[PDB]
Amino acid sequence: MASRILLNNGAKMPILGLGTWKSPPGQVTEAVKVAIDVGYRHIDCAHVYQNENEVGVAIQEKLREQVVKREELFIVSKLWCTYHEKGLVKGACQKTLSDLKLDYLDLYLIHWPVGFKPGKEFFPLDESGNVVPSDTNILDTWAAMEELVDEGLVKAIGISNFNHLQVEMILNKPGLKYKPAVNQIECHPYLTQEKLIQYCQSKGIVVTAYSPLGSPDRPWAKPEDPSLLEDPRIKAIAAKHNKTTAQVLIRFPMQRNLVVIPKSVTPERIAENFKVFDFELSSQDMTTLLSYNRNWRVCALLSCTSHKDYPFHEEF
Ligand SMILES: NC(=O)c1ccc[n+]([C@@H]2O[C@H](COP(=O)([O-])OP(=O)(O)OC[C@H]3O[C@@H](n4cnc5c(N)ncnc54)[C@H](OP(=O)(O)O)[C@@H]3O)[C@@H](O)[C@H]2O)c1
Ligand SMILES: O=C(O)COc1cc(Cl)ccc1C(=O)NCc1cccc([N+](=O)[O-])c1
Numbered sequence: 001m002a003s004r005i006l007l008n009n010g011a012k013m014p015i016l017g018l019g020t021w022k023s024p025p026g027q028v029t030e031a032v033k034v035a036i037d038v039g040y041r042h043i044d045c046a047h048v049y050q051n052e053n054e055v056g057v058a059i060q061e062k063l064r065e066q067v068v069k070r071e072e073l074f075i076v077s078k079l080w081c082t083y084h085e086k087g088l089v090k091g092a093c094q095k096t097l098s099d100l101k102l103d104y105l106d107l108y109l110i111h112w113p114v115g116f117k118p119g120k121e122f123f124p125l126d127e128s129g130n131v132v133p134s135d136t137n138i139l140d141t142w143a144a145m146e147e148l149v150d151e152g153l154v155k156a157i158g159i160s161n162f163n164h165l166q167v168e169m170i171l172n173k174p175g176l177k178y179k180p181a182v183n184q185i186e187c188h189p190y191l192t193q194e195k196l197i198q199y200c201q202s203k204g205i206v207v208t209a210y211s212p213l214g215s216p217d218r219p220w221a222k223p224e225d226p227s228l229l230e231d232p233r234i235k236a237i238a239a240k241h242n243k244t245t246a247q248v249l250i251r252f253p254m255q256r257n258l259v260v261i262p263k264s265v266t267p268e269r270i271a272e273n274f275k276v277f278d279f280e281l282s283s284q285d286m287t288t289l290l291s292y293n294r295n296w297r298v299c300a301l302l303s304c305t306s307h308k309d310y311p312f313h314e315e316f
Pocket of ligand 1: 044209212216
């Protein structure tokens with residue numbers, strides 16, 4: 001299948017990208033260099049991941065080496081929750097641009113719909129462990145994102161972890177100038193997201209699937225927790241196709257017209273994860289994988305459950 005999807009800003013986005021959350025700063029430069037050498041042209045980044053400088057070293061070296069042209073890369077980053085205020089958005093973007101060694105981003109996302117009190121801490125808490133909110137709403141934050149397009153800092157803007165009512169809130173924003181191009185959400189066979197994906201696709205918003213392997217390195221993993229990579233049912237589909245379980249989990253979202261961003265710092269896995277354009281899952285395989293949905297979420301924080309804009313109280 002085609003390697004890129006057309007966005008509603010007229011630009012093409014590679015459907016496979018490299019994730020970078022948890023990639024250690026002393027490993028991620030090599031990881032990104034390896035990824036570009038073996039064909040990745042999309043890197044998913046964020047200021048909160050604390051490794052954009054090191055990601056940037058890799059990107060710059062491959063540009064300098066003329067392995068790739070800047071126009072051929074699709075670099076994504078995200079506005080952290082403590083920068084939702086109007087007056088902080090441009091500087092947050094510029095800090096990311098500086099760390100990544102870029103003069104524009106292809107896509108910049110509102111990372112989470114929830115805004116937090118600005119300051120040095122990424123998760124400001126009160127004395128009982130609740131996050132301290134920002135009174136800035138998603139529509140004013142969106143207007144600030146729109147300004148970044150008009151200043152040439154970003155080619156496209158989008159959202160991440162927005163539920164359908166929140167997406168609808170931006171789509172219905174008075175004076176909306178740019179529609180979100182992308183909603184990046186968690187999506188895998190245990191959280192299949194049929195309702196939110198159809199909503200977004202029906203609006204011409206491209207959906208990016210994060211944690212496609214179930215984030216086995218997430219820091220809050222429990223023993224109890226389901227494991228996609230070890231699910232014998234998925235292992236059997238992989239065996240049938242002479243592919244790895246990871247490769248099935250990556251191809252699955254691709255065939256739903258999603259973008260997918262598996263993370264690895266292991267060079268052999270980075271290469272393996274890209275070798276997903278030479279096989280097809282059957283319609284039966286797809287429906288079978290969809291059937292494993294358990295509404296199981298890697299990413300959701302108890303500290304944020306009372307924030308006005310917490311996204312996961314809603315069904316979708
Ligand atoms: N927008 C958001 O709020 C949000 C939230 C979560 C994630 N994301 C983005 O989505 C990315 C992907 O999600 P994720 O990092 O949570 O988890 P993931 O991609 O589902 O899983 C990454 C884990 O899988 C292992 N792995 C990778 N390829 C493998 C393979 N072929 N075989 C066996 N194990 C393999 C990795 O190990 P090694 O690295 O040790 O190889 C790592 O432990 C993130 O890195 C981030 O860029 C965005
Ligand atoms: O968010 C990501 O991309 C991945 O997860 C990260 C990454 C880092 Cl570096 C730090 C913390 C997290 C995390 O707890 N994310 C979950 C989260 C955050 C904010 C709000 C919520 N929420 O539920 O409103 C949830």
